[PDB]
Write a protein that binds this ligand. Structure first.
Ligand SMILES: Nc1ncnc2c1ncn2[C@@H]1O[C@H](CO)[C@@H](NC(=O)[C@H](N)Cc2ccc(O)cc2)[C@H]1O
Ligand SMILES: Nc1ncnc2c1ncn2[C@@H]1O[C@H](CO)[C@@H](NC(=O)[C@H](N)Cc2ccc(O)cc2)[C@H]1O
Lengths: 163, 151
């Protein structure tokens, strides 16, 4: 499993509508957060629940905010901050083959959706259901973000010696 | 070397005493981390990928057009947090990151090469070693990660 985590002052997420006509507004705002983390999440074809549990534990525990004087002191839960979780199969874009990315390592969409929904539910259980916001799996999205730092963290659970 | 590439409709980068120093419209924001053991060849690979990866569509083909094809812009942001050591702690420790003073000179070379491979006008950068606020419109979103030590 792969994730890019970014520290933000805020984020507004909109999604492309299913029902689109000519001469119409096509994107609709579905999620908004203030301070916290945006997590772009990619599910690998061979991911297990243990991969997901590692990512969730890490995201919730990363100490990415300063306190009064102390550097890298507080995690997202400590400050009652929010998380915006966005499904992102492009993290499996293989860029070694030339200029056209291929995404064959990404978990197949039907199982990935179920997996994604389990992950969101687990984020809500481990933290606070009011603090977890999501996009719309499988849809084009627009995200207006204020990056704070910036602070960008990348985790691939396959780089980890997980059992 | 590590990069996070995000496809954007625009980005506005500001720094403290906030003041806007860089802005782009459509293109890429590239968060770039330099490893203590990186070589010029690592840099060249990342620059090549940022400039040539086909992260936009043609009318009839997906993933067919790159940033240079569309005459779009790039915002390059130095980001040592990509070497956070999250494997070993929950507080980021940047020991795998290249020493900042030496990294700055290396980064200068990288930016020059971006400008050489593309053009001066289309490359914008942040403020190395400073706090930055970056207002971004992520388009897709489309996020690409490359670690040259993994190829
Ligand atoms: N394996 C997966 N992991 C995470 N998300 C996934 C996975 N498989 C499918 N998805 C979701 O379905 C969408 C299309 O594949 C994925 N969408 C995206 O990655 C962004 N909308 C970017 C995008 C843009 C255009 C495009 O043709 C494909 C993808 C994700 O929401
Ligand atoms: N090895 C490096 N690779 C990329 N950038 C680097 C590297 N070493 C130093 N830098 C630059 O100096 C800053 C940390 O001293 C880096 N900045 C950042 O990572 C972001 N402004 C986040 C940040 C913000 C504040 C802070 O106290 C520490 C980090 C980068 O501009």
């Amino acid at each position: 499993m792969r994730v890019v985590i970014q520290r933000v002052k805020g984020a507004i997420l909109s999604v492309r509508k299913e029902n689109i006509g000519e001469n119409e507004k096509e994107l609709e705002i579905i999620s908004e957060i203030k301070n916290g983390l945006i997590c772009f999440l990619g599910i690998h074809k061979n991911d297990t629940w243990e991969d997901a549990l590692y990512i969730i534990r890490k995201c919730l525990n990363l100490r990415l905010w300063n306190n009064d004087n102390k550097t890298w002191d507080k995690n997202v839960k400590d400050l009652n901050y929010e998380l915006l979780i966005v499904s992102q199969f492009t993290l499996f874009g293989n860029t070694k083959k030339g200029n056209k990315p291929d995404f064959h390592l990404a978990k197949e969409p039907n199982e990935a959706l179920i997996f994604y929904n389990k992950i969101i539910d687990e984020f809500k259980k481990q933290y606070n259901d009011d603090k977890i916001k999501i996009g719309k799996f499988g849809n084009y999205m627009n995200i207006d973000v204020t990056n704070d730092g910036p602070v960008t963290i990348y985790i691939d659970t396959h780089d980890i010696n997980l059992n």
